[PDB]
Design a protein around this ligand. Structure first.
Ligand SMILES: COc1cc2c(NC3CCN(CCCCCN)CC3)nc(NCCCN(C)C)nc2cc1OCCCCCN
Ligand SMILES: [Zn+2]
Ligand SMILES: [Zn+2]
Ligand SMILES: [Zn+2]
Ligand SMILES: [Zn+2]
Length: 255
């Protein structure tokens, strides 16, 4: 246990850092942030009159909810987990209720905006690197964590040497660079048969150029199991020429 909480209390629950492999301290060559940040101007559309919202008089569990319609339909069940019908292979955009909605803060269409609910842990792996794992079982379709970092423009990401922490939000594209500023997600390793899938979500604003990346479990994740997600083709078309994926999956597509 090299750190009581890498989030310094910014998350709803601590994210401890342990090392049972060697004596290396907890990573400290980056700034931990719980929400996305920018290192320049960024004209995100936060005009409240531009927000589409609902006028539900219930807990937004009816087919009339405008926010559910924008999401195709509300995909969250009573527990806040994605319904079985959710398409993990090609996730729809999710629009959660916002402050312009007539509903209450505890309505059904609010999950990602409620923050971290799982017991996660940053840990030293065998390959002398770092990974993240759940310390509890996590049912399928559960929101685990958001991919947080430095929001930057495509051209800006194009002049950065270290590109191993980028995440594309594919006119005019933007990326999230978790190299200098990032949250626990910057430590999740790649996996060809991922237990985590990224979903584009909109909460306080609905500027389509700036979706927020939420990781939902693709199946039951057992306590102690390491978290992972598919980095994608761009990552491997570039890094594939430097090393082979070691996710160790019988279906590994990058080794
Ligand atoms: C590591 O894998 C990734 C690399 C990326 C990258 N790399 C470039 C390579 C060339 N240098 C050039 C360096 C020049 C240096 C000059 N001193 C700048 C960074 N650029 C961009 N977007 C910008 C592409 C240009 N646009 C015009 C299309 N996105 C990337 C997304 C990646 O997968 C992310 C997958 C998830 C991984 C999560 N950890
Ligand atoms: Zn509603
Ligand atoms: Zn609502
Ligand atoms: Zn709403
Ligand atoms: Zn692999």
């Amino acid at each position: 246990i090299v750190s009581r909480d890498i989030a310094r209390g910014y998350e709803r629950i601590p994210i401890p850092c342990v090392n049972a492999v060697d004596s290396e301290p907890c990573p400290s060559n980056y700034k931990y942030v719980s929400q996305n940040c920018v290192t320049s101007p960024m004209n995100i559309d936060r005009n409240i009159t531009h927000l589409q919202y609902c006028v539900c008089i219930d807990d937004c569990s009816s087919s009339n909810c405008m926010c559910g319609q924008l999401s195709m339909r509300c995909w969250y069940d009573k527990d806040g987990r994605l319904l079985p019908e959710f398409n993990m292979a090609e996730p729809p955009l999710i629009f959660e209720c916002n402050h312009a909605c007539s509903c209450w803060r505890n309505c059904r269409n609010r999950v990602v905006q409620n923050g971290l609910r799982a017991r996660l842990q940053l840990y030293r792996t065998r390959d002398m690197g770092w990974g993240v794992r759940s310390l509890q079982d996590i049912p399928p379709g559960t929101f685990v964590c958001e991919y947080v970092g430095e929001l930057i423009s495509d051209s800006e990401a194009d002049v950065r040497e270290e590109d191993s922490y980028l995440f594309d939000l594919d006119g005019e594209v933007y990326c999230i660079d978790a190299r200098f500023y990032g949250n626990v997600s910057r430590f999740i390793n790649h996996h060809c048969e991922p237990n985590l899938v990224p979903v584009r979500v909109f909460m306080a604003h609905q500027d389509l150029r700036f979706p927020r990346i939420a990781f939902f479990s693709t199946r039951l994740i057992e306590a102690g199991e390491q978290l992972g997600f598919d980095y994608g083709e761009r990552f491997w078309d570039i890094k594939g020429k430097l090393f082979s994926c070691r996710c160790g999956s019988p279906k590994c597509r990058h080794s």
